[PDB]
Design a protein around this ligand. Structure first.
Ligand SMILES: CCCCCC/C=C/CCCCCCCCCC(=O)O[C@H](COC(=O)CCCCCCCCCCCCCCC)COP(=O)(O)OC[C@@H](O)CO
Ligand SMILES: Nc1ncnc2c1ncn2[C@@H]1O[C@H](COP(=O)(O)OP(=O)(O)O)[C@@H](O)[C@H]1O
Ligand SMILES: Nc1ncnc2c1ncn2[C@@H]1O[C@H](COP(=O)(O)OP(=O)(O)O)[C@@H](O)[C@H]1O
Ligand SMILES: OC[C@H]1O[C@H](O[C@H]2[C@H](O)[C@@H](O)[C@@H](O)O[C@@H]2CO)[C@H](O)[C@@H](O)[C@@H]1O
Ligand code: BEF
Ligand code: BEF
Ligand SMILES: [Mg+2]
Ligand SMILES: [Mg+2]
Lengths: 371, 490, 374, 293, 358
């Protein structure tokens, strides 16, 4: 069902953990919430479920104002961040509890519990209590209890955080297949950047009580509205270098790198509200830096860190007159030592630019995949 | 599904028993009991009627119980404090009048009587012992008030003297006969064997005044003190007195009476200290024991657990008295042991401090199981992983106890502890049975002793002290010590 | 409303209530009036509460001292036995059951403390208190002791304290003078001094209580004790060859134990007063009626002259009645409350050595005199 | 589960418990002694010199051949008293659990105006001195009796009913405990569509099972040992509870100690069984595995 | 301190949760445990803690047997999977709990608490109780509680699992900083591969309660001992294909696709394994593999492509850098490189790869 928040505020005394938040989740929409630990992702889910009061503003689900409705009467189901399993009941009973409350038949209950248990790989653990399970098992139990219930609105608070990589892949698919079968609204909180990119119809980025930006996955990756969003989506983080405006065209901005040579480069980025001489922040992603051998703008420096991931190599570089190390990602196992000299290329078409207030000069290079 | 109709049905059915039993209470005369039962039932129905009063559904049964058997008694006890309800004034005014109007005096002669059948009618014989004369009536029938002309005789009557059984069955009709001697004296049944000139000591004038038909003296209601006093008041007062309102008189009497106030403060201190030490020692002894007896390494625990509560499974009355024997200064097996080991004989009743120690030892023995049992339950609320954390923080058993176990228990124990303080404050029974309050506080005009609580010394005043049992005085003191312990919960 | 045309009786659980029920069964056979006997716990406190509201038993059996209270409260009928009936009972008993100069109950049995002695240790019992400290010295040689009794309760020590002019409230002439209290005077001090001196000389112990006293007599450890008729069955089970005799004399004068007269009163609210009178006068208070109750549980000494004289063929009962007669009727006045505590304290103070006899009793007189006034 | 250390601490605990137990058992062993002593004596040796089975025989229904040869039938039905005690205490206790649990739930989980005043009123008002209470109570059950005679005077119903008001403290005890349990279990329950009643019965109660045993026990004890109210309401000998019946042994001048003691020991027996039984609900780790945190 | 296990077994009655595990962790070593959910990672860790009993085998900490020594006497500290915070205590009080126990020095405590809370970005939460924290915030309090105590051995069970990407990066770094500065042994459990790769001196791979392999990060990645490790290290999972001639220094096998191509592999019914990162564009390689595109996932930094191949039951996952515009149902071709291929016996064991990786 549709879920809409209008000027939703939430305060604990004088602490404001949600400020004026506005969201329009349409029916069947898969929406992923992301943001820094402690920003308000669970507080939002709890206000939707009805487990926390709303200070001011209006919550609408399926078009009826829900601020004062009891939780049981919202058509909302939740996979709590804390799991909140019934410790006196076994896996089976945990997963079949919501059904038993309805007048559900035993064979109806058994079919759709055994079924959800085998895709979650909990089949051999049906009999155990929550105390006799691992953290990743307990977490699956929590998922599986909401899956059997098939509510109108799924809330999943960080539901894969305690799973091995491989299983995390399988669960992602099952949640995805479910959302495609039932076509029901799903609100999904995660810290894993891959989950966000692969599951979301729309991603909401929150920052300390506010919505930072709502968008399609790729729309957020390529065109962050501001420095925070840019620094939050994609990991390893986007590099930032201070730069000076030198010249402006309606369609492009020219900047001066802070190195002693003071190299200049044009960027395909709006010049709206950009004055010559101002200090901007230039962003470039580790994936988007280029090897030096074939490049117009070269940055060179001294390696501080090497991280060998197997599939790739990440190299952190101290480049003179910039405080923060540059992070660069090379495919495959590149053999480089700490302290070595290293140079990378900086491609103008993939550079972002942020005003002093941290707002983004809209990138005008049309990046493939965003329509 | 149990029908939706079935709700408004059962609610209509029960809301009918209400009325059937309420207007039925309005009859004969039960008005306080009708008004009270109306508000209580009506609240019950409305609460279960609209689903907006949901939460009250859970509270109402319990609160109703409490109002009925806790609150109501408290109200009466307070009420009683504004009246002179006592041994001396125990009856209502109506009952006292009724008693005085049942009083009699012997106005004339006394004749043994006999009942003799004449066919299917009766004959009444009287016998004048003091002259040897004998009288006999004409044949009459039983039923209602009738007057009988008795005539002097020398002859026996024809019928066989009737039984006590026959006299008894006909006792009502017999008691309605006025017999008249030849010489003009009226005489009525005064026992199963005698007819006499017994007469009502007082007559009700109807304007309120009672007048004695023997002395001629006159009496009116004096609702200031609650007695019939002579008439403008005389020196004489008729018992039984009646219960009557006295405004603040019992409350002031505690404040105005210098002499009942000499040891007040000093006794109060001891009662506070007695309560505190008891609560402390019982919570502490009980908590530790509960901790020890849930310790899975402790192999005897299931048996220990049982044995440790037995002081609470046996009624305290015999136990207290056995302790009194146990603590006997010259006899009694405690000082006979302290004789051998340690070479001392503590003066457990003679010496104020050692008496207080004795009382606290006995109280702790009585009270630790209660605190133990509470802890046995409360201890289950502490999750086991907190002690895994403490272990990973380098905690020992002693450290576990004081940094995790004690702080996690004192919160839910707080109300139970405040309550245990109030109960031990008024622990009248223990002191009476054990020490009687002694030893003696010398120079106390109204008598007090060193181990007396406030309750012990105060009810000595109301119930002993020689004025009979003064229920009003005791009720007022009960309210005063209540407003004091209520202000002590600050 | 007490139910008309039947009799409900309350009597304590240590009396022969089954015996009384057979007397009631006879009464029913002769009258068709059913009698029910009850023995509820704390009936002495229960009665005042039910009777005030015009309910309760038609007849209550308790010791007389409590009946002065009920009478004052307006709960007891004024009874009227004729001179012929009164002659059948010991005249001193009729003094016990009077309120404001009027009879309020029928005396049934008489109770008082007597001197109990071990015959195998002490064949000839001493007639005087002064003889005892000598007698303890010759027993101490053989390991025993002369006399142990409850030194803790004034009821048990008052006999000696009273012997020489110690008294509660002056029993003038039917009236008890509330202002005239005899716990301070010369004979009280003499009584209490003689007691303190027995402890001082280690013939007795200042903290000997009921329990210890009884246990020592029943084990043959002390040659004598002071105790009431309620104690005999323990001694019978113990098989101590024992006698009950007159209490020893103090300065040539009789011990004066307190006298408890078991009495039957009619509820002022009863519609069955005449039935109650008949039951009590002509059924219970006869040789045959009293023997029915006695056989169930022994009454001790009874107030009915004729039946006492057959009971008295038992030396124990004779002894009881003798000590009764030479003793003090328990005053049935409210002011006796104050007496008990004050006196109990004074003895303890003097025995344990906290106070001397003089000031102890001076203080106890002060406490009763000012309680009975204000 | 945890790796245990020094077993010198167990030895010292066993030694201290044993010494504590002997000390607190001593007074009760003398009650047992009084019950086995011939005659009626409050004092004497721990093993009575003259042992007697008579007090226990009369308590258990047996007749006693005495010294002169005549047979003494049991004066009182002590065993039926005991059964009347189990019934009054058991039903009483069930009712006090049921009434205080439901009450604690509203106090612990729901919100309603003046909740705080009520809770503090509840604890305050039960702490008023019970001195003139029995006067009020009698007058109450006398009235009630003519309308619902099942709960009037001289009925177990009335006695059971009288006790059901004593809940204030048990309420705070269960409230207290309810609050140690994480809200999120009943929160989750509510999103499974469970009613507040269902959340109460199906989730919260099974986890609160130890504090349910505590209040059941504390109530059963109170009821078994209770004298004043039961004695004021019960008239018929055959309806007496054991606490009321054993009062017969107490007279103004002496006590039938032997019979009183046998009665006293007997009354501990139902307390002991109820205590033993309730242990099955006294378990640790009921909430283990429920809430990460 | 050092920590070594010797034939350690652990049984829950008769369910074996640890079988014959042997580990040498040298003083100052950072070891990470990885493995599928429920394989016995927390159990193992808990046996080192002393929070669980060892059934058979020897455990030694700093060259002394510890099987029987209780948790509090082992010189260990732990960040719990479920945090296990003190609910009655503030953040400050939770963090200062260990120190307060063994020689409380007012200022020393305040100082090390403020310092650790700053790196954990917890400085504004010091006064809160655990119920007024977020899940990730509570996770960091648990971490803070152990770091502040500075035990001889640090045990950390999935300690970053509920932190956002950027904060996770920062926490790895600080954990590393502290591992170099203290040079004390750290045993660290995680499901994040990047953490395993970048932190570990040694990775211990666990499977259903037994040690599948132990080695350097890159060692396990290039040279897995068996099919299970191969499929567990590196995510997305290594692709598997069910593969005639056998040279005296390399092996030759046949591709199951209906053309039946034959290729040599520099190694010792086999399973052939190739990682999605190691597959090549079509035009470059000799061996070409072609099928139908099933799933396309646009990750921003890279594109991942699932390809259903004729006669091959399992989809083939391909990783390629940058945003590649490919659609479901389209035809896709990729190169199979022979030197980057893994090979596995019928039972499970790998044929040692002889191609030297950098
Ligand atoms: C005035 C006091 C009178 C008390 C008399 C009691 C009489 C009984 C005799 C026994 C004397 C105590 C002997 C102690 C022996 C050591 C106990 C022990 O070695 O055993 C410990 C048991 O703890 C435990 O009782 C905790 C150990 C208790 C230590 C604290 C005792 C200090 C006493 C004062 C406490 C004041 C309480 C304040 C009340 C307001 C083991 O527990 P741990 O595994 O660490 O905890 C975690 C798990 O248990 C969780 O379930
Ligand atoms: N009961 C509470 N009182 C005050 N603040 C709280 C309470 N519960 C959580 N918070 C705060 O609210 C903020 C948002 O919480 P939450 O939504 O759980 O964070 P997240 O976005 O990580 O899920 C956090 O910074 C947390 O400290
Ligand atoms: N008390 C128990 N009884 C039986 N099996 C248990 C018990 N506790 C945990 N287990 C099982 O032991 C296995 C290993 O647990 P754990 O070490 O927590 O796994 P993980 O590797 O995910 O940390 C799991 O399959 C788990 O369900
Ligand atoms: O505090 C000593 C005291 O303990 C017990 O009293 C309990 C009682 O049993 C409970 O029912 C409740 O009312 O609280 C009291 C403790 O606060 C003993 O019953 C009592 O004899 C003893 O003095
Ligand atoms: F803790 Be395991 F990975 F579920
Ligand atoms: F700390 Be939050 F739940 F990311
Ligand atoms: Mg959260
Ligand atoms: Mg784990």
């Amino acid at each position: 069902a549709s879920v809409q928040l209008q000027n939703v505020t939430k305060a604990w005394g004088e602490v404001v953990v949600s400020k004026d938040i506005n969201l329009d989740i349409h029916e069947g929409e898969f929406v992923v919430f992301v943001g820094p630990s402690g920003c308000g992702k669970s507080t939002l889910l709890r206000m939707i479920a009805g487990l926390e009061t709303i200070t001011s503003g209006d919550l609408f689900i399926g078009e009826k104002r829900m601020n004062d409705t009891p939780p049981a009467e919202r058509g909302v189901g939740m996979v709590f961040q804390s799991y909140a399993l019934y410790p006196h009941l076994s896996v089976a009973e945990n997963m079949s509890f919501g059904l038993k409350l309805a007048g559900a038949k035993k064979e109806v209950i058994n079919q759709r519990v055994n079924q959800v248990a085998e895709v979650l790989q909990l089949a051999h653990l049906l009999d155990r209590k929550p105390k006799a399970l691992s953290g990743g098992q307990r977490q699956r139990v929590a998922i599986g209890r909401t899956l059997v219930a098939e509510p109108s609105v799924f809330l999943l608070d960080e539901p894969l955080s305690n799973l091995d990589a491989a299983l995390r892949v399988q669960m992602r698919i099952e949640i995805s297949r479910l959302h495609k079968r039932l076509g029901r609204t799903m609100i999904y909180v995660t810290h894993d950047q891959v989950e966000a990119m692969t599951l979301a119809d729309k991603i909401v980025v929150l920052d300390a009580g506010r919505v930072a930006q709502v968008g399609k996955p790729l729309e957020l990756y390529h065109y962050p509205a501001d420095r925070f969003v840019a620094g939050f989506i994609g990991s390893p983080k986007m590099n930032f270098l201070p730069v000076k405006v030198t010249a402006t065209a309606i369609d492009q901005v020219q900047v001066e790198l802070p190195m002693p040579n003071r190299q200049q480069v044009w960027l395909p980025v709006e010049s709206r509200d950009v004055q010559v001489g101002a200090n901007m922040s230039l962003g470039i992603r580790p994936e988007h830096l280029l090897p030096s051998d074939i490049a117009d703008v070269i940055l060179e420096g001294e390696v501080q860190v090497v991280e060998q991931l197997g599939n790739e190599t990440q190299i952190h570089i101290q480049i003179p007159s910039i405080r923060q190390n540059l992070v660069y990602r090379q495919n495959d196992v590149v053999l480089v030592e700490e302290g070595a000299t290293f140079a990378i290329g900086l491609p103008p078409e993939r550079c972002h630019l942020f005003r002093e207030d941290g707002t983004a000069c809209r990138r005008l290079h049309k990046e493939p995949g965003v329509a | 599904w149990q029908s939706d109709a079935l709700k408004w049905s059962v609610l209509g059915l029960l809301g009918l028993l209400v009325g059937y039993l309420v207007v039925l209470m309005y009859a004969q005369g039960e008005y306080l009991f009708a008004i009270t039962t109306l508000i209580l039932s009506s609240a019950g129905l409305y609460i279960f009627a609209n689903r907006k009063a949901y939460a009250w559904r859970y509270v109402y049964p319990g609160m109703a119980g409490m109002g009925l058997f806790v609150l109501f008694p408290l109200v009466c006890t307070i009420a009683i404090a504004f009246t002179n309800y006592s041994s001396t004034n125990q009856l209502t005014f109506e009952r006292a009048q009724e008693v005085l109007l049942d009083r009699s005096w012997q106005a004339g002669k006394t004749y043994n009587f006999g009942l003799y059948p004449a066919g299917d009618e009766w004959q009444l014989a009287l016998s004048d012992g003091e002259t040897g004369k004998n009288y006999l009536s004409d044949a009459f029938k039983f039923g209602g008030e009738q007057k009988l002309q008795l005539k002097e005789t020398t002859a026996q009557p024809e019928g066989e003297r009737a039984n006590l059984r026959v006299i008894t069955q006909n006792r009502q009709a017999l008691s309605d006969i006025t017999a008249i001697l030849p010489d003009g004296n009226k005489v009525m049944m005064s026992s199963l064997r005698q007819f006499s000139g017994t007469q009502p000591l007082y007559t009700l004038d109807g304007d309120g005044t009672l007048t004695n038909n023997q002395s001629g003296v006159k009496y009116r209601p004096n609702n200031q003190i609650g007695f019939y006093q002579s008439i403008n008041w005389g020196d004489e007062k008729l018992s039984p007195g009646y219960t009557v309102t006295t405004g603040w008189k019992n409350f002031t009497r505690v404040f105005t009476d210098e002499g009942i106030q000499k040891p007040f403060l000093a006794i109060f201190v001891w009662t506070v200290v007695f309560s505190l030490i008891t609560v402390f020692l019982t919570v502490a002894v009980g908590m530790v024991l509960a901790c020890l007896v849930q310790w899975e390494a402790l192999r005897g625990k299931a048996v220990y657990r049982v044995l440790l509560i037995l002081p609470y499974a046996v009624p305290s009355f015999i136990s207290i008295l056995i302790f009194k024997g146990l603590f006997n200064q010259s006899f009694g097996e405690i000082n006979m042991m302290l004789s051998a080991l340690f070479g001392v004989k503590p003066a457990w009743f003679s010496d104020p401090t050692t008496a207080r120690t004795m009382l606290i030892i006995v109280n702790t023995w009585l009270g630790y199981p209660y605190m133990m049992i509470l802890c046995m339950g409360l201890l289950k609320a502490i999750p086991d992983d907190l002690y895994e954390a403490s272990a990973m923080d380098g905690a020992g058993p002693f450290q576990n106890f004081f940094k995790i176990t004690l702080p996690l228990l004192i919160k839910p124990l707080t109300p139970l502890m405040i309550a245990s303080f109030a109960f031990n404050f008024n622990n009248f029974v223990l002191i009476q049975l054990l020490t009687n309050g002694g030893p003696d506080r010398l120079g106390t005009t109204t008598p007090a002793g060193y181990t007396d609580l406030l309750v012990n010394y105060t009810y000595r005043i109301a119930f002993e002290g020689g004025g009979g049992q003064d229920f009003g005085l005791a009720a007022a003191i009960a309210t005063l010590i209540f407003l004091l312990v209520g202000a002590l919960a600050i | 409303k007490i139910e008309e045309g039947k009799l409900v009786i309350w009597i304590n659980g240590d009396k022969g209530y089954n015996g009384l029920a057979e007397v009631g069964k006879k009464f029913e056979k002769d009258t068709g009036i059913k009698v029910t006997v009850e023995h509820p716990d704390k009936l002495e406190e229960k009665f005042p509460q039910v009777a005030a509201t015009g309910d309760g038993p038609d007849i209550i059996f308790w010791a007389h001292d409590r009946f002065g209270g009920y009478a004052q409260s307006g709960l007891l009928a004024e009874i009227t036995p004729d001179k012929a009936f009164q002659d059948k009972l010991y005249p001193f008993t009729w003094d016990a059951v009077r309120y404001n100069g009027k009879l309020i109950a029928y005396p049934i049995a008489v109770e008082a403390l007597s001197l109990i002695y071990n015959k195998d240790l002490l064949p000839n019992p001493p007639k005087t208190w002064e003889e005892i400290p000598a007698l303890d010295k010759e027993l101490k040689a053989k390991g025993k002791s002369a006399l142990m009794f409850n030194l803790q309760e004034p009821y048990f020590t008052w006999p000696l304290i009273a012997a020489d002019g110690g008294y509660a409230f002056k029993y003038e002439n039917g009236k008890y003078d509330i202002k005239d209290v005899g716990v301070d005077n010369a004979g009280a001090k003499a009584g209490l001094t003689f007691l303190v001196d027995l402890i001082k000389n280690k013939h007795m112990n200042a903290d000997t209580d009921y329990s210890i006293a009884e246990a020592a007599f029943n084990k043959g450890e002390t040659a004598m004790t002071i105790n009431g008729p309620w104690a005999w069955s323990n001694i019978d089970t113990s098989k101590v060859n024992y006698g009950v005799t007159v209490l020893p004399t103090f300065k040539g004068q009789p011990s004066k134990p307190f006298v408890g007269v078991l009495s039957a009163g009619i509820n002022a609210a009863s519609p069955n007063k005449e039935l109650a009178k008949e039951f009590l006068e002509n059924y219970l208070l006869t040789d045959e009626g009293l023997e029915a109750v006695n056989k169930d549980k022994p009454l001790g000494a009874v107030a009915l002259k004729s039946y006492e004289e057959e009971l008295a063929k038992d030396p124990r009962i004779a002894a009881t009645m003798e000590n009764a007669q030479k003793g003090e009727i328990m005053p049935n006045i409210p002011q006796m409350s104050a007496f008990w505590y004050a006196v109990r304290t004074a003895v303890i103070n003097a025995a344990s050595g906290r106070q001397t006899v003089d000031e102890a009793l001076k203080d106890a007189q002060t406490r009763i005199t000012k309680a009975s006034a204000s | 589960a945890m790796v245990q250390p020094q077993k010198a601490r167990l030895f010292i605990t066993h030694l201290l418990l044993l010494l504590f137990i002997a000390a607190i058992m001593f007074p009760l062993l003398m009650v047992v002694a009084i019950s086995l002593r011939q005659g009626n004596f409050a004092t004497g040796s721990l093993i009575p010199e003259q042992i007697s089975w008579d007090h226990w025989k009369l308590a258990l229904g047996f007749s006693v051949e005495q010294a002169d040869g005549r047979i003494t039938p049991p004066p009182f039905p002590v065993l039926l008293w005991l059964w009347n005690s189990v019934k009054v205490a058991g039903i009483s206790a069930i009712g006090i659990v049921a009434l205080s649990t439901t009450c604690a739930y509203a106090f612990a989980r729901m919100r309603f105006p003046g909740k705080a005043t009520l809770l503090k009123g509840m604890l305050i008002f039960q702490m008023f001195p019970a001195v003139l209470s029995l006067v009020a109570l009698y007058a109450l059950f006398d009235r009630l009796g003519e309308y619902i005679p099942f709960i009037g005077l001289n009925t177990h119903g009335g006695v059971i009913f009288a006790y059901l008001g004593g809940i204030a403290l048990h309420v705070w005890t269960i409230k207290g405990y309810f609050e140690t349990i994480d809200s999120s279990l009943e929160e989750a329950a509510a999103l499974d569509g469970a009613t507040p009643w269902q959340a109460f019965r199906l989730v919260l109660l099974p986890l609160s099972v130890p504090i349910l045993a505590v209040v059941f026990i504390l109530s059963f004890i109170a009821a078994i040992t209770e004298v004043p109210v039961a004695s004021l309401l019960l008239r018929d000998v055959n309806s007496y509870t054991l606490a009321v019946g054993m009062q017969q042994y107490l007279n103004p001048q002496n006590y039938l100690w032997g019979d009183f003691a046998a009665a006293a020991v007997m009354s501990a027996l139902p307390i002991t069984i109820v205590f033993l039984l309730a242990q099955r609900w006294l378990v640790n780790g009921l909430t283990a595995g429920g809430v990460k945190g």
